[PDB]
PDB file of C-alpha atoms in Angstrom:
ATOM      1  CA  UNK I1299     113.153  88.430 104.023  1.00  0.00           C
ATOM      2  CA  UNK I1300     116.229  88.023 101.205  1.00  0.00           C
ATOM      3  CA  UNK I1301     117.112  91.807 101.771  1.00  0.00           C
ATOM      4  CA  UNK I1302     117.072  91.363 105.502  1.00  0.00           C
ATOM      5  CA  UNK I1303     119.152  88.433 104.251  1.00  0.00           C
ATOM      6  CA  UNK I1304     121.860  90.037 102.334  1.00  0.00           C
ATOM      7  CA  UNK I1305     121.941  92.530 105.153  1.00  0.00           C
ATOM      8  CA  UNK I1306     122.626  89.655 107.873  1.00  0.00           C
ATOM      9  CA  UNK I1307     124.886  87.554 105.451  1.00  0.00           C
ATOM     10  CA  UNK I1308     126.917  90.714 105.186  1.00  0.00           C
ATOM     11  CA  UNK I1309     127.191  90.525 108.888  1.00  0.00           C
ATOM     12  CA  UNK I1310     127.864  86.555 108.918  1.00  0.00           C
ATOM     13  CA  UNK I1311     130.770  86.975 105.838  1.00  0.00           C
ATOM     14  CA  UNK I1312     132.033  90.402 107.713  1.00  0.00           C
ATOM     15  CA  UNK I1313     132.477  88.536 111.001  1.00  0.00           C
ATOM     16  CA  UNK I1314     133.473  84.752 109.444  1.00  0.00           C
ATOM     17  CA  UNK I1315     135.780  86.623 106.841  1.00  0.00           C
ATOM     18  CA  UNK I1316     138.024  87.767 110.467  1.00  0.00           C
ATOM     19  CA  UNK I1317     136.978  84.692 112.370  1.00  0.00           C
ATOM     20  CA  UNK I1318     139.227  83.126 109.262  1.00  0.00           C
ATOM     21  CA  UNK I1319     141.605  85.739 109.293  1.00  0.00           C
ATOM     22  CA  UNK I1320     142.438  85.253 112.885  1.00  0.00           C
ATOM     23  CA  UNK I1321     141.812  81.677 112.573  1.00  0.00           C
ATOM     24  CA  UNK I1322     144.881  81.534 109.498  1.00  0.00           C
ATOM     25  CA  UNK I1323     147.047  83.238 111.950  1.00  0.00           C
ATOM     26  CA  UNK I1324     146.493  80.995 114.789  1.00  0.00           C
ATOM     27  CA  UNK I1325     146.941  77.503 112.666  1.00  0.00           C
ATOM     28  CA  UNK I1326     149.947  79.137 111.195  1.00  0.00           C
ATOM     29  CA  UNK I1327     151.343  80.189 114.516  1.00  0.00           C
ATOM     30  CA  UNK I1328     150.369  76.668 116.070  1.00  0.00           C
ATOM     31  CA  UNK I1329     152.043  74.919 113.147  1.00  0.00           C
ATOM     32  CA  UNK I1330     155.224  76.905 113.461  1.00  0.00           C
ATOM     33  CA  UNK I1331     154.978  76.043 117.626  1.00  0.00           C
ATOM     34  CA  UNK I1332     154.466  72.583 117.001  1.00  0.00           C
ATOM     35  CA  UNK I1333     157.370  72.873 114.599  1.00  0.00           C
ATOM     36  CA  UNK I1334     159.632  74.742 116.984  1.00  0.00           C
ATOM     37  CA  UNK I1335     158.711  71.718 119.555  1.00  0.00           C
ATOM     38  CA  UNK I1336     159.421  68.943 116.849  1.00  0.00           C
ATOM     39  CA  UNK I1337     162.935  70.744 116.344  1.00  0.00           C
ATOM     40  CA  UNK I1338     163.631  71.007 120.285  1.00  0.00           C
ATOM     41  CA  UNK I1339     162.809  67.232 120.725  1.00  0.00           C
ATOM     42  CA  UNK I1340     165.138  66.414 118.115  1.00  0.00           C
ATOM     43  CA  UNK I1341     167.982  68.970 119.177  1.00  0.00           C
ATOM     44  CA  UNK I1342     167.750  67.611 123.205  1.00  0.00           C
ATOM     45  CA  UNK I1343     167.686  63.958 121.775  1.00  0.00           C
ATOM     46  CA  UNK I1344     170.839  64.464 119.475  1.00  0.00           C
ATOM     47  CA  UNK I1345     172.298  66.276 122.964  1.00  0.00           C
ATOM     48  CA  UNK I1346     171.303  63.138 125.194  1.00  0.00           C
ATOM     49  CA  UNK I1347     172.179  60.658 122.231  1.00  0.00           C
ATOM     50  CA  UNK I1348     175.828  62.345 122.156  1.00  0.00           C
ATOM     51  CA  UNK I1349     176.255  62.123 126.224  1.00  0.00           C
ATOM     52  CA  UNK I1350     175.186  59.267 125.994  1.00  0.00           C
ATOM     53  CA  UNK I1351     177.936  57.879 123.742  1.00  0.00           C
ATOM     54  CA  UNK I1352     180.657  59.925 125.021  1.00  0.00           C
ATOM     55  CA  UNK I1353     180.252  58.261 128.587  1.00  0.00           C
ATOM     56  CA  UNK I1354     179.988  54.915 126.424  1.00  0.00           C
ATOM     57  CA  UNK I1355     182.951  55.175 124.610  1.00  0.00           C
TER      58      UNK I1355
ATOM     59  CA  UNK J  83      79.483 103.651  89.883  1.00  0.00           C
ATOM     60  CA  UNK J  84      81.009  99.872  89.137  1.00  0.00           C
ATOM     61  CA  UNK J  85      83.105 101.365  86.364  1.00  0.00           C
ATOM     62  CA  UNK J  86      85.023 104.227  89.186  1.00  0.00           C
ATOM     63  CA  UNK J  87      85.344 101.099  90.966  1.00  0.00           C
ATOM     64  CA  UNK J  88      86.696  98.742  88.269  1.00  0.00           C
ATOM     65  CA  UNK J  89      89.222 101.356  86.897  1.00  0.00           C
ATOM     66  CA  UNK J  90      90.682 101.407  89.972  1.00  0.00           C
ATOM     67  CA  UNK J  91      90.749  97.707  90.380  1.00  0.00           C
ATOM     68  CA  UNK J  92      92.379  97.287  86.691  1.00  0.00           C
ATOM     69  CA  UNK J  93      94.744  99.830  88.427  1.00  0.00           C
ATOM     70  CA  UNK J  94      95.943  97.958  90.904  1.00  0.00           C
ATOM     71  CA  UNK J  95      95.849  94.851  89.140  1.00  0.00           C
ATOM     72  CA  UNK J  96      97.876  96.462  86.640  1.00  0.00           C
ATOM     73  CA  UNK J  97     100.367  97.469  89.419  1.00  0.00           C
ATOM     74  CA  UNK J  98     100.568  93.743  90.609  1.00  0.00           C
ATOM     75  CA  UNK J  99     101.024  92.929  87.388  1.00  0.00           C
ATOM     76  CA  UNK J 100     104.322  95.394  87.010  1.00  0.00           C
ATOM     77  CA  UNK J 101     105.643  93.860  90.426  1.00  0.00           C
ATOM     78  CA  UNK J 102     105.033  90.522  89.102  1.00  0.00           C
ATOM     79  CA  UNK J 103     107.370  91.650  85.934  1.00  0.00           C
ATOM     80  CA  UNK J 104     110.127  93.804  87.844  1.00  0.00           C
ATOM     81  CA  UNK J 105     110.649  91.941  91.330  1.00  0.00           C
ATOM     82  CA  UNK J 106     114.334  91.596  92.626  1.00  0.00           C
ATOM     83  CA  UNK J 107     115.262  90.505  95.775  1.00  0.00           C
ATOM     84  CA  UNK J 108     119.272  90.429  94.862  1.00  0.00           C
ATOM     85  CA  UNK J 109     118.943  93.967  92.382  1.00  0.00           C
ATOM     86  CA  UNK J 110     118.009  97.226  92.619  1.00  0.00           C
ATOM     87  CA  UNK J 111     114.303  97.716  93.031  1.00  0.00           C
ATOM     88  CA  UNK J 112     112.232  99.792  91.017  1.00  0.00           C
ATOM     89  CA  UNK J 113     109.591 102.295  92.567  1.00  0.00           C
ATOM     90  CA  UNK J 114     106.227  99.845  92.251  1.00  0.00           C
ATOM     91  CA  UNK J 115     108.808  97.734  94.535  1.00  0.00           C
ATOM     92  CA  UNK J 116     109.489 100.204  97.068  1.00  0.00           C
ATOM     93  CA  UNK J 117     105.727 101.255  97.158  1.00  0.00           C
ATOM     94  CA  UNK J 118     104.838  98.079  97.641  1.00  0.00           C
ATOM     95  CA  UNK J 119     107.277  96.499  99.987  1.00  0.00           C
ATOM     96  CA  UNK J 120     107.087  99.960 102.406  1.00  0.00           C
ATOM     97  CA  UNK J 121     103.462  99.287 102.584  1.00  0.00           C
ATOM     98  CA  UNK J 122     103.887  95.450 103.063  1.00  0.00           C
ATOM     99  CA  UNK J 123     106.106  96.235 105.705  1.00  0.00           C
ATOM    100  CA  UNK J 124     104.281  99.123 108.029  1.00  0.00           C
ATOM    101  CA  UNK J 125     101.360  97.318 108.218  1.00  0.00           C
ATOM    102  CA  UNK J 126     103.825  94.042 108.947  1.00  0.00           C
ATOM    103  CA  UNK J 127     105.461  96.281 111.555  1.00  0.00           C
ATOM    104  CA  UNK J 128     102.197  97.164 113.043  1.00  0.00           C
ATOM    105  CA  UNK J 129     100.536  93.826 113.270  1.00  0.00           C
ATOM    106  CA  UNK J 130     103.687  92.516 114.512  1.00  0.00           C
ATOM    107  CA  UNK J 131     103.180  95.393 117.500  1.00  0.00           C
ATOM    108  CA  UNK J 132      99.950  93.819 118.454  1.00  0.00           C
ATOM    109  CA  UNK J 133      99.367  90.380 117.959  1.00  0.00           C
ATOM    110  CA  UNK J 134     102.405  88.830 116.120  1.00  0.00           C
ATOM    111  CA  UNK J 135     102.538  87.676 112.532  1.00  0.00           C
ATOM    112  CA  UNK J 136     102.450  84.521 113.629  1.00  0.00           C
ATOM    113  CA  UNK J 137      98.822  83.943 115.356  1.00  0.00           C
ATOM    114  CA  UNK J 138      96.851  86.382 112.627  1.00  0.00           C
ATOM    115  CA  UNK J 139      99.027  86.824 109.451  1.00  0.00           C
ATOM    116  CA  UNK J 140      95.891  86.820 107.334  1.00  0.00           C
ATOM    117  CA  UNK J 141      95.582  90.021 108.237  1.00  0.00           C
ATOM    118  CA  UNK J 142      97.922  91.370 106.455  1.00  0.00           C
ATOM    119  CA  UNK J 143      96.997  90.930 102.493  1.00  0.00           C
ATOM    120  CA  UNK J 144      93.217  92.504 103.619  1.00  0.00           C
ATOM    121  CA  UNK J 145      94.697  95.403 104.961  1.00  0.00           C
ATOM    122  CA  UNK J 146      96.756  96.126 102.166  1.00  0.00           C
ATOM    123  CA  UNK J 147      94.468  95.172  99.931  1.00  0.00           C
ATOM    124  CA  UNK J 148      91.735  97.832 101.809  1.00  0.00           C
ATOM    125  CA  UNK J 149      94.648 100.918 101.244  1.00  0.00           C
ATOM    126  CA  UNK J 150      95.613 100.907  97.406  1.00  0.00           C
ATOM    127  CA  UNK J 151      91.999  99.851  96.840  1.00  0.00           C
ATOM    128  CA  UNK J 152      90.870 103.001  98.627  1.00  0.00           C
ATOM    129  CA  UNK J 153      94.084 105.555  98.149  1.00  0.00           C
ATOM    130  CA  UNK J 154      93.977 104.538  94.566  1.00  0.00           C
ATOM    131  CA  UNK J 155      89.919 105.654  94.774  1.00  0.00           C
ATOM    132  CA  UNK J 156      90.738 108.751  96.457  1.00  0.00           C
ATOM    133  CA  UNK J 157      93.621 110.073  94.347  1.00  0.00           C
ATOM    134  CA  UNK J 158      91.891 109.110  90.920  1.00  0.00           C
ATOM    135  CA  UNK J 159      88.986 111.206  92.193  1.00  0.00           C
ATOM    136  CA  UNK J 160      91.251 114.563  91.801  1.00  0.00           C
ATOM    137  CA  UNK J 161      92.139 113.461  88.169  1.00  0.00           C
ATOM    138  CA  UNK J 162      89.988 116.544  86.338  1.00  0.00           C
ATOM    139  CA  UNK J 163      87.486 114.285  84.695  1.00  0.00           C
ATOM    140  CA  UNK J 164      85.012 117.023  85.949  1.00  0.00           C
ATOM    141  CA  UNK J 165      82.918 118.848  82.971  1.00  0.00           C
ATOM    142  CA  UNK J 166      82.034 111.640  84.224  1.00  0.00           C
ATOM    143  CA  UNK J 167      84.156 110.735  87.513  1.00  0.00           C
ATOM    144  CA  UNK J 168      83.380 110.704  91.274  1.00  0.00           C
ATOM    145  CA  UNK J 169      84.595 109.190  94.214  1.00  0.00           C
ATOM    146  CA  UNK J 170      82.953 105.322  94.490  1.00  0.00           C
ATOM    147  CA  UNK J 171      83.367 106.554  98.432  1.00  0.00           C
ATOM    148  CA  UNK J 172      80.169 108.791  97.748  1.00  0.00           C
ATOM    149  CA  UNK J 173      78.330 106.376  97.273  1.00  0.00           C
ATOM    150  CA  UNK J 174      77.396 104.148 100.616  1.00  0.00           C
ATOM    151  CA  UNK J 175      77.357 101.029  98.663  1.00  0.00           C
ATOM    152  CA  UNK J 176      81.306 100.699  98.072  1.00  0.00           C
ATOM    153  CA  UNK J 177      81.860 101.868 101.601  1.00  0.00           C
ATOM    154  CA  UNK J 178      79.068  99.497 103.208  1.00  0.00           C
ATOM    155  CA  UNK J 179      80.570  96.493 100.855  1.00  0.00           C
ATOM    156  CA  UNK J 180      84.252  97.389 102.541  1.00  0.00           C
ATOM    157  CA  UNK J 181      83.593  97.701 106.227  1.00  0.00           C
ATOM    158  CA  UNK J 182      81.069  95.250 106.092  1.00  0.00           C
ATOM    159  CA  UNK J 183      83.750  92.202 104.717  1.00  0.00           C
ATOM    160  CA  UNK J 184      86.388  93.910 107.174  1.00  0.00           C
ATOM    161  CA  UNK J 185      83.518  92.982 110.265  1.00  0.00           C
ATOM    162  CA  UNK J 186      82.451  89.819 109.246  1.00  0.00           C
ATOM    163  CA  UNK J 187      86.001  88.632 108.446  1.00  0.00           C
ATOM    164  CA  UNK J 188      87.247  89.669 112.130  1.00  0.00           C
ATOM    165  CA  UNK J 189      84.745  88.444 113.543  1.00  0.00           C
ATOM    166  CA  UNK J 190      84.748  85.010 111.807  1.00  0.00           C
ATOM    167  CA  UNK J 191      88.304  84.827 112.806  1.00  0.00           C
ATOM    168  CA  UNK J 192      87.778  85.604 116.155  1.00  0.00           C
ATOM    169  CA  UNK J 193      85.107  82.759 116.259  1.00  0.00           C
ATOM    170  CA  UNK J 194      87.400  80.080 114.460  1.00  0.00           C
ATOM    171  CA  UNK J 195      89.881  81.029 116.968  1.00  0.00           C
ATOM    172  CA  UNK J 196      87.946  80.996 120.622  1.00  0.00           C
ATOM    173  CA  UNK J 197      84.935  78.990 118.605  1.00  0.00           C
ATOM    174  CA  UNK J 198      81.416  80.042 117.976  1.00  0.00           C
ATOM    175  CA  UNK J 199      80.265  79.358 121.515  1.00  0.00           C
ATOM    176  CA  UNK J 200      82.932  80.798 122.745  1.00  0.00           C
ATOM    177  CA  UNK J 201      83.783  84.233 121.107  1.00  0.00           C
ATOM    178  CA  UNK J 202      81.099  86.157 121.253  1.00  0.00           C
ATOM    179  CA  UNK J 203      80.505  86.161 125.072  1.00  0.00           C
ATOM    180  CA  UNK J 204      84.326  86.953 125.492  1.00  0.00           C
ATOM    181  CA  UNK J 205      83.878  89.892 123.406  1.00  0.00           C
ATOM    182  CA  UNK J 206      80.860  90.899 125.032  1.00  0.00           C
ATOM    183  CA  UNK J 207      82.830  90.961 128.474  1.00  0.00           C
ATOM    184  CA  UNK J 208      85.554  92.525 127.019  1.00  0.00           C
ATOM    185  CA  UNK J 209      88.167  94.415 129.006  1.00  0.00           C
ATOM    186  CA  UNK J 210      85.929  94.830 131.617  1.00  0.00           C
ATOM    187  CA  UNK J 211      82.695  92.745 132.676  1.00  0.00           C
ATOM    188  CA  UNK J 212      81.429  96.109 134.511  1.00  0.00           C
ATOM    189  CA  UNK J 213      81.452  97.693 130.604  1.00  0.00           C
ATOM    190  CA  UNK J 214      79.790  94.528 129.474  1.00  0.00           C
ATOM    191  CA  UNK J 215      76.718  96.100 128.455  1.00  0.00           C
ATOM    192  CA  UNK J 216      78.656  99.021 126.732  1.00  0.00           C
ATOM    193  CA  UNK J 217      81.405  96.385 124.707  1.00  0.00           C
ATOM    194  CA  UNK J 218      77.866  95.467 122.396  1.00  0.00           C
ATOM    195  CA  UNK J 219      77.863  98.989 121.572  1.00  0.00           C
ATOM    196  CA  UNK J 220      81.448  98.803 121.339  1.00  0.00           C
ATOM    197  CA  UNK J 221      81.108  95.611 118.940  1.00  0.00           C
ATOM    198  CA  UNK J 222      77.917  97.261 116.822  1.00  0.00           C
ATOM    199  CA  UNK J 223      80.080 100.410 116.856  1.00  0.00           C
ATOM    200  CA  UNK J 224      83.187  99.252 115.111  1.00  0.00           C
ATOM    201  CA  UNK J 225      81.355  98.591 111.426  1.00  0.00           C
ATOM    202  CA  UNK J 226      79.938 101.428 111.499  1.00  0.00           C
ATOM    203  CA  UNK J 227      82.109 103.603 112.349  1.00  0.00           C
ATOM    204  CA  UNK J 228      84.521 102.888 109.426  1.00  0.00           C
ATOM    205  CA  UNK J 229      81.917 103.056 106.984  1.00  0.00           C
ATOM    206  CA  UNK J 230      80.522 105.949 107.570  1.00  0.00           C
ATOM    207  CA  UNK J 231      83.593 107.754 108.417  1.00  0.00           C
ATOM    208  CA  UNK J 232      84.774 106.520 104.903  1.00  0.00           C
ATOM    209  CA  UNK J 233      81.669 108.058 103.197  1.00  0.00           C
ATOM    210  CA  UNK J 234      81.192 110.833 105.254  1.00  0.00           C
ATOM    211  CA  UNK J 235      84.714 112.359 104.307  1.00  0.00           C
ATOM    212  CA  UNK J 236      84.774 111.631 100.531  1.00  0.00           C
ATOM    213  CA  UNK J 237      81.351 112.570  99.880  1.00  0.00           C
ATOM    214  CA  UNK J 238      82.538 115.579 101.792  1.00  0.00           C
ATOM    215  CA  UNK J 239      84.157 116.014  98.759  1.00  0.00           C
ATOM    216  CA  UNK J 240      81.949 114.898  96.495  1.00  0.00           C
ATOM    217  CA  UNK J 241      79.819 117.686  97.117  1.00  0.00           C
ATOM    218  CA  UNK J 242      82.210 120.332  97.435  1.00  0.00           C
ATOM    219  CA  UNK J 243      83.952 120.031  94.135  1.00  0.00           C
ATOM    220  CA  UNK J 244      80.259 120.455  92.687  1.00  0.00           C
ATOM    221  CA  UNK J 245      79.540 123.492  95.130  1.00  0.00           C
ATOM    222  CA  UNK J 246      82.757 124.792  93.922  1.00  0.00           C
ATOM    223  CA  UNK J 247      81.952 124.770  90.656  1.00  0.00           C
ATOM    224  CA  UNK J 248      78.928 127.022  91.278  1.00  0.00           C
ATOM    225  CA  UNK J 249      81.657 129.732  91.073  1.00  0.00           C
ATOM    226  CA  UNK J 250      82.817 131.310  87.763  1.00  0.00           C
ATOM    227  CA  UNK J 251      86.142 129.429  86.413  1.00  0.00           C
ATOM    228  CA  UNK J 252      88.567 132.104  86.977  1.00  0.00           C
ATOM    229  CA  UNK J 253      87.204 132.101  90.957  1.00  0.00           C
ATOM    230  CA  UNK J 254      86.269 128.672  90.478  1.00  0.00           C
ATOM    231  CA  UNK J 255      90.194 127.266  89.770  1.00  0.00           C
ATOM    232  CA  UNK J 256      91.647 128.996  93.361  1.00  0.00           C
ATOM    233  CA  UNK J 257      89.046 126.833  95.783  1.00  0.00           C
ATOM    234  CA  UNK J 258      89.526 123.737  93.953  1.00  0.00           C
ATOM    235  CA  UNK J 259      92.784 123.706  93.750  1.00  0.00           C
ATOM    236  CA  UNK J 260      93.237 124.290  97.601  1.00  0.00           C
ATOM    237  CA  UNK J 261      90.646 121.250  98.524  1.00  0.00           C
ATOM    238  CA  UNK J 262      92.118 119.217  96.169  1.00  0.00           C
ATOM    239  CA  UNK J 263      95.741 119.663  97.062  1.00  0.00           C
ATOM    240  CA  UNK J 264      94.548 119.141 100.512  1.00  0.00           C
ATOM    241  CA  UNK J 265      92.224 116.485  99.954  1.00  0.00           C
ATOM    242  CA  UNK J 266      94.687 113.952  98.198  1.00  0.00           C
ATOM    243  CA  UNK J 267      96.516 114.438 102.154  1.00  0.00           C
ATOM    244  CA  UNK J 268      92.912 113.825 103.657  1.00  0.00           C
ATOM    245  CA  UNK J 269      92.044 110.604 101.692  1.00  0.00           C
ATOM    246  CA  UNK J 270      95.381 108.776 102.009  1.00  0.00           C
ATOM    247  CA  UNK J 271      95.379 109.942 105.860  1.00  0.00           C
ATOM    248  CA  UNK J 272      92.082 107.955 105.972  1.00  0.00           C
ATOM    249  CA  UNK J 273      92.940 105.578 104.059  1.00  0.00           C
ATOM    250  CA  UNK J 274      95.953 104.970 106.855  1.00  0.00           C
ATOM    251  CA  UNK J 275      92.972 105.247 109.393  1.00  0.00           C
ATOM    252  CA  UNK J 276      90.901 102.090 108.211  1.00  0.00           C
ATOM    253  CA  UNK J 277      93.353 100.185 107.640  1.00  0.00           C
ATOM    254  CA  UNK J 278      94.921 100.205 110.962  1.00  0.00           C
ATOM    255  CA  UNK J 279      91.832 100.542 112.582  1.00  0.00           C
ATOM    256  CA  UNK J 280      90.871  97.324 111.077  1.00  0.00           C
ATOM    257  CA  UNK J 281      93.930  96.233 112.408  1.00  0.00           C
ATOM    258  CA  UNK J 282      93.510  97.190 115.698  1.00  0.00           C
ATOM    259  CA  UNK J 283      90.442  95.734 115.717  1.00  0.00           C
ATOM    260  CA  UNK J 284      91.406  92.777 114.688  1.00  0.00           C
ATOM    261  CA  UNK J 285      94.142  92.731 116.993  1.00  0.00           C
ATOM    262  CA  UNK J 286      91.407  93.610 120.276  1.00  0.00           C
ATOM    263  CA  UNK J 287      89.109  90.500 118.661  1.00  0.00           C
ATOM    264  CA  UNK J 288      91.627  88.138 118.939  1.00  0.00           C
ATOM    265  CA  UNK J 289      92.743  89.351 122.993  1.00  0.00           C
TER     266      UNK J 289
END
């Protein structure tokens, strides 16, 4: 049963080892979109804050 | 006879004892592993083809047990100890004592699984009620026919390496040689016989 074991836990580390792969790729991509977002949201509100003032003054 | 026997016991024992020692799931196995574990695991593979480890695993140590106990029996009696040593097989007391615990233990189990009113007279009907009278000597048949299958092939032998040796040694060492060469190939091949015909039995006594 433990060297069917190793055998099956090389399959189970084989395939989590690229679920993690892919998975570090994906959080890093999602962190940089969420970034990108944060950035855009802060550009557009600096763009409307500006308008905003120029029509004040 | 009790002392072919018991060497080959000590043998095996011995053997168990080296497995005991080496055993390594996570490292590299040693042969006494791989002899054991590929035996372990045919007749695992075969009970698991009939019944499934998981209603008659008991089987499994017995059957094992049966094949070093006999293979070990066989090939020890082509060791050259001709001039104290014979097969234990020749003698019907060894094979009667083997088949005979193989039968009752089946059956047993087939009783403490269906009961002891109810086993026997589903094994009687059997496959078929129309062969009902026929299963008995189907039942009384399957004892008997692995012990004196057992016997009748080594003391086959028994006799032969002492007819043999009615010839002059120089003629004498080209007919042994042959039936012994062969005959190491004929006792583990029946050695692979009762033990999976105790399995199948046991496997047909259950269903």
């Amino acid at each position: 049963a433990e060297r069917e074991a190793m055998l099956a836990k090389t399959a189970a580390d084989n395939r989590k080892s690229a679920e993690q792969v892919a998975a570090a790729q994906a959080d890093y991509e999602k962190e940089m979109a969420e970034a990108r977002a944060q950035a855009s949201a802060l550009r557009d509100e600096a763009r409307a804050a500006g308008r905003s003032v120029v029509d004040e003054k | 006879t009790i002392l072919a026997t018991a060497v080959t016991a000590v043998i095996v024992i011995a053997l168990a004892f080296y497995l005991r020692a080496k055993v390594t799931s996570t490292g590299v196995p040693s042969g006494v592993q791989l002899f054991w574990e590929a035996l372990t695991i045919q007749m695992r593979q075969q009970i698991e083809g009939s019944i499934g480890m998981k209603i008659a695993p008991f089987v499994l140590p017995l059957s094992v047990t049966i094949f070093v106990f006999i293979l070990i029996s066989n090939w020890l009696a082509v060791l050259p100890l001709q001039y104290l040593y014979k097969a234990p097989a020749s003698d019907i007391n060894f094979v009667l004592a083997l088949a005979l615990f193989v039968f009752v233990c089946y059956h047993a189990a087939g009783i403490w699984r269906r009961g002891i009113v109810g086993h026997p007279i589903k094994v009687v009907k059997g496959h078929v009620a129309f062969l009902a009278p026929i299963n008995i000597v189907e039942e009384l048949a399957k004892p008997i026919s692995l012990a004196l299958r057992l016997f009748g092939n080594i003391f086959a032998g028994g006799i032969l390496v002492a007819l043999i040796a009615m010839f002059p040694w120089y003629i004498q060492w080209f007919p042994n040689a042959v039936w012994k060469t062969f005959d190491l190939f004929v006792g583990l091949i029946q050695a692979f016989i009762f033990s999976l015909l105790t399995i199948l039995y046991f496997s047909q006594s259950m269903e």
